[PDB]
Every structure is written in structure tokens, then in C-alpha cells.
Design a protein around this motif. Structure first.
Motif, mmCIF file in Angstrom:
data_model
loop_
_atom_site.group_PDB
_atom_site.id
_atom_site.type_symbol
_atom_site.label_atom_id
_atom_site.label_comp_id
_atom_site.label_asym_id
_atom_site.label_seq_id
_atom_site.Cartn_x
_atom_site.Cartn_y
_atom_site.Cartn_z
ATOM 1 N N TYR A 55 116.782 -57.710 1.408
ATOM 2 C CA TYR A 55 117.354 -56.395 1.145
ATOM 3 C C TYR A 55 118.591 -56.265 2.025
ATOM 4 C CZ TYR A 55 112.330 -55.909 0.031
ATOM 5 O OH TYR A 55 111.032 -56.104 -0.392
ATOM 6 N N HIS A 56 119.778 -56.444 1.443
ATOM 7 C CA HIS A 56 120.997 -56.448 2.248
ATOM 8 C C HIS A 56 121.280 -55.073 2.837
ATOM 9 C CE1 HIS A 56 121.944 -60.562 1.200
ATOM 10 N NE2 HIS A 56 121.758 -60.272 -0.076
ATOM 11 N N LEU A 57 120.354 -54.590 3.654
ATOM 12 C CA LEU A 57 120.455 -53.250 4.199
ATOM 13 C C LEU A 57 121.669 -53.168 5.119
ATOM 14 C CD1 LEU A 57 116.759 -52.185 4.988
ATOM 15 C CD2 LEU A 57 117.982 -52.269 2.821
ATOM 16 N N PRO A 58 122.532 -52.158 4.968
ATOM 17 C CA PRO A 58 123.614 -51.963 5.950
ATOM 18 C C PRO A 58 123.108 -51.763 7.376
ATOM 19 C CG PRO A 58 123.394 -50.076 4.443
ATOM 20 C CD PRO A 58 122.638 -51.217 3.840
ATOM 21 N N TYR A 59 121.803 -51.566 7.552
ATOM 22 C CA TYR A 59 121.092 -51.353 8.806
ATOM 23 C C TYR A 59 119.604 -51.278 8.478
ATOM 24 C CZ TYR A 59 121.425 -46.361 7.361
ATOM 25 O OH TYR A 59 121.373 -45.172 6.660
ATOM 26 N N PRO A 60 118.739 -51.926 9.268
ATOM 27 C CA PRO A 60 117.300 -51.949 8.942
ATOM 28 C C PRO A 60 116.690 -50.584 8.649
ATOM 29 C CG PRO A 60 117.827 -52.749 11.195
ATOM 30 C CD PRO A 60 119.045 -52.864 10.355
ATOM 31 N N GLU A 61 117.184 -49.515 9.280
ATOM 32 C CA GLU A 61 116.655 -48.178 9.036
ATOM 33 C C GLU A 61 117.046 -47.615 7.675
ATOM 34 O OE1 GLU A 61 119.475 -47.703 12.264
ATOM 35 O OE2 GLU A 61 118.705 -49.669 11.647
ATOM 36 N N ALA A 62 117.901 -48.307 6.914
ATOM 37 C CA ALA A 62 118.314 -47.784 5.615
ATOM 38 C C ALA A 62 117.128 -47.587 4.676
ATOM 39 C CB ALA A 62 119.348 -48.713 4.977
ATOM 40 N N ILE A 63 116.099 -48.435 4.773
ATOM 41 C CA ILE A 63 114.968 -48.329 3.857
ATOM 42 C C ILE A 63 114.200 -47.023 4.053
ATOM 43 C CG2 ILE A 63 113.307 -49.518 5.330
ATOM 44 C CD1 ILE A 63 112.957 -51.094 2.261
ATOM 45 N N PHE A 64 114.398 -46.343 5.184
ATOM 46 C CA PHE A 64 113.805 -45.036 5.441
ATOM 47 C C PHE A 64 114.760 -43.884 5.150
ATOM 48 C CE2 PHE A 64 109.945 -46.441 7.611
ATOM 49 C CZ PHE A 64 110.289 -47.715 8.034
ATOM 50 N N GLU A 65 116.015 -44.169 4.800
ATOM 51 C CA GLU A 65 117.018 -43.120 4.639
ATOM 52 C C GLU A 65 117.124 -42.633 3.198
ATOM 53 O OE1 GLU A 65 120.643 -42.521 3.843
ATOM 54 O OE2 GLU A 65 120.285 -40.553 4.747
ATOM 55 N N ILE A 66 117.242 -41.309 3.043
ATOM 56 C CA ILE A 66 117.236 -40.718 1.710
ATOM 57 C C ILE A 66 118.487 -41.101 0.922
ATOM 58 C CG2 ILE A 66 118.233 -38.529 2.521
ATOM 59 C CD1 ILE A 66 115.625 -39.218 -0.375
ATOM 60 N N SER A 67 119.664 -41.122 1.559
ATOM 61 C CA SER A 67 120.854 -41.392 0.756
ATOM 62 C C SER A 67 120.861 -42.834 0.271
ATOM 63 C CB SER A 67 122.139 -41.069 1.525
ATOM 64 O OG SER A 67 122.246 -41.810 2.724
ATOM 65 N N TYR A 68 120.377 -43.763 1.093
ATOM 66 C CA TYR A 68 120.255 -45.139 0.630
ATOM 67 C C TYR A 68 119.221 -45.257 -0.480
ATOM 68 C CZ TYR A 68 120.061 -50.185 0.549
ATOM 69 O OH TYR A 68 120.122 -51.498 0.151
#
Ligand code: KZU
Ligand code: CL
Ligand code: ZN
Length: 296
Positions: A55-68
């Protein structure tokens, strides 16, 4: 002039069976569901962050972020399939709160958990403040639609690896868990302002009291209200590095806070046994576990 005759589990049980103790607030966290086989996904030692890979997350916390989530929901739903519990069997601790409810003692259960086990164990939505939301219901994310979907519908999408979309408008459907960037349920603060005017006993189970909003609830109790912590480790004390309302279990000024250190299920069992509720609790757990195991 304190309400507990001694700062022990026996003292708490005598207080609970006295006329002074009528309304109990439970604060519960991931530690009451680990014995049900549900790991604490907020613990770094669990390894959620190394599990995230393709998951090419811009940052590991992205998977918890609503806008992502709203632009790229596929990683979340893949993680949800990987983390989906294999069974939902509430613990002795969950059924202990159902007993509190049955006996008219439960004012409210505040939970950090999203696993729905409080509801399976027989707490109703009126009894619960899910501080981080819940998988129990899901909603279409379009503000003009907001169609609600039950967990059975969401489960089927998750396992079939079909990104859930609303049948009315084809927007995404999101579990009612609170992502980063989402505001806390408004009921959290409303219930907090009202409940802590009425509480006689705070029962804190299976939480380290480190993450908001839980990191501030114990300071909302009236000064006289006893606070029992049933937890593997002591928690809620003031942090010496940040300079009150913290737990004071062991000082000469301690007067109302009690720590029972061990597995949450064993502590709740010990309390129920002191109260004369052990047979009731065993009968309830064994019946509900048998019912869940027999689901066909
Ligand atoms: C780090 O903290 C950030 C702050 N924050 C946010 C929240 C609210 O929750 C989340 C919000 C966004 C994203 C995630 C990631 C997860 C997805 N799925 C997870 N599942 C479990 O872990 C097992 S329970 C369970 N039960 C049922 C019925 C179904 C399933 C799939 N799982 S975790 C959690 N809480 N704290
Ligand atoms: Cl915490
Ligand atoms: Zn919709």
C-alpha cells in the motif's frame, strides 16, 4: 471520611453492596478483548505498521485517515479482511457488565473497542459510548444519503473483496469507526457531561488510559467516587515528566483508588465471586458461549 472501608477488591465489593453504590460507569479498552482473540491494534508491539506493505501510503498512518480512505479505500478494506476476527465470543469481563446491567447498576460503559463484543454480550446502544466508533453499523459517506448498513452486509463485502458501495447512490460505505480526521461522536461529550454527575463507582478495565479521549475520563469523576482498575499493569497515574486527577493507589494520601493487577477476566471473576455473583456469571457465560459456538 472515605467511601471505601479499605483500598482493596474486598473493600470495593462491600461498597458495591452498600446503599451508597447505585450507579457504575465502566471504562474499558483493548485489554478486555485480547482474551477473546482480538489483538490490540493500537499497540506498536502488535505489528500493524510492519504489516502494511504494497500500500504505497504517503505515510503509514494514512490507512487510519479519513481523507485517504475516501480517495483510496482499498488498503483499509484489505486490512479489515486480514484483521477480521474468526469468532466473536465476549469475555467474562463483557458478561460481567451485562450482569451489572441486569441488576440495574450500569450507568454507562465507555469503550475504546470497535469489535462489537459489548453488544453481543447484551449491552444496548443506550448503555454504550463507543469512543472510537464501532463496526456494528456502517454508513454511506455521502452527506445527502447516509444509508445505514448492518455488519452482515459489510462482512460480505469485506470477505468477497468488493469495495462496499451504497446501493442508493454508489458512494463508499464506511464502518462507523472513527478515522483520523473525524470528530469524536458528539454523544461522547454529551454523555460525559451528564454521566459523571451521577456516578458512584468507576470500574476501569483493560485500558492503559494513554490515548484520547480516555486519557481524561478518570479526572471527570467526583472527588469521592472510588475508582477500581482491573488491568495487567497499573495505569492512570500522573506522569512525573509532565508536571490533579490522576490515580493515587499507594501514597499515604490514597483514599479511593484500587488496583487489581492481573488478567481482566480473573479480576472480574474475583469481584463477581465476592459479590455472590459467581454462579450467575458462570451460568451466563457458559450459556452464551454455547449459543455462539452452536451458530449454524
Ligand atoms: C491507531 O489508532 C488511531 C486512532 N483510532 C482510530 C480508531 C477507530 O478504529 C479504526 C479506524 C480506522 C482504521 C482502523 C484499522 C482497523 C481496521 N479493522 C480493524 N480490526 C480490528 O482491529 C479487529 S476488531 C474487528 N471487528 C469487526 C467486527 C470487524 C473487523 C474488521 N475488525 S483495525 C481502525 N481507533 N483508534
Ligand atoms: Cl489507551
Ligand atoms: Zn448513499
Amino acid at each position: 471520611e472515605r467511601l471505601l472501608d479499605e483500598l482493596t477488591l474486598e473493600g470495593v465489593a462491600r461498597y458495591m453492596q452498600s446503599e451508597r453504590c447505585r450507579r457504575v460507569i465502566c471504562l474499558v479498552g483493548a485489554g478486555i478483548s485480547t482474551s477473546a482473540g482480538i489483538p490490540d491494534f493500537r499497540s506498536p508491539s502488535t505489528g500493524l505498521y510492519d504489516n502494511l506493505e504494497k500500500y504505497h501510503l504517503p505515510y503509514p498512518e494514512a490507512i487510519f485517515e479519513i481523507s485517504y480512505f475516501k480517495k483510496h479505500p482499498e488498503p483499509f478494506f484489505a486490512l479489515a479482511k486480514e484483521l477480521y476476527p474468526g469468532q466473536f465470543k465476549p469475555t467474562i469481563c463483557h458478561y460481567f457488565m451485562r450482569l451489572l446491567k441486569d441488576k440495574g447498576l450500569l450507568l454507562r460503559c465507555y469503550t475504546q473497542n470497535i469489535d462489537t463484543l459489548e453488544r453481543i454480550a447484551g449491552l444496548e446502544q443506550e448503555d454504550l459510548v463507543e469512543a472510537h466508533g464501532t463496526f456494528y453499523t456502517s454508513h454511506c459517506v455521502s452527506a445527502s444519503c447516509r444509508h445505514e448498513y448492518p455488519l452482515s452486509w459489510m462482512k460480505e463485502k469485506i470477505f468477497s473483496e468488493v469495495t462496499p458501495k451504497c446501493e442508493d447512490c454508489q458512494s463508499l460505505v464506511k464502518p462507523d469507526i472513527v478515522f483520523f480526521g473525524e470528530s469524536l461522536p458528539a454523544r461522547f461529550f454529551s454523555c460525559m457531561q451528564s454521566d459523571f454527575l451521577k456516578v458512584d463507582l468507576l470500574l476501569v478495565m483493560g485500558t492503559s488510559l494513554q490515548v484520547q479521549p480516555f486519557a481524561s475520563l478518570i479526572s471527570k469523576a467526583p472527588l469521592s467516587t472510588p475508582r477500581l482498575l482491573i488491568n495487567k499493569e497499573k495505569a492512570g497515574q500522573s506522569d512525573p515528566f509532565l508536571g490533579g486527577g490522576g490515580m493515587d493507589f499507594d501514597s499515604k494520601k490514597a483514599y479511593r483508588d484500587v488496583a487489581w493487577l492481573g488478567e481482566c477476566d480473573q479480576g472480574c471473576l474475583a469481584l463477581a465471586e465476592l459479590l455472590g455473583w459467581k454462579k450467575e456469571l458462570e451460568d451466563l457465560v457458559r450459556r452464551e458461549h454455547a449459543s455462539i459456538d452452536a451458530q449454524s
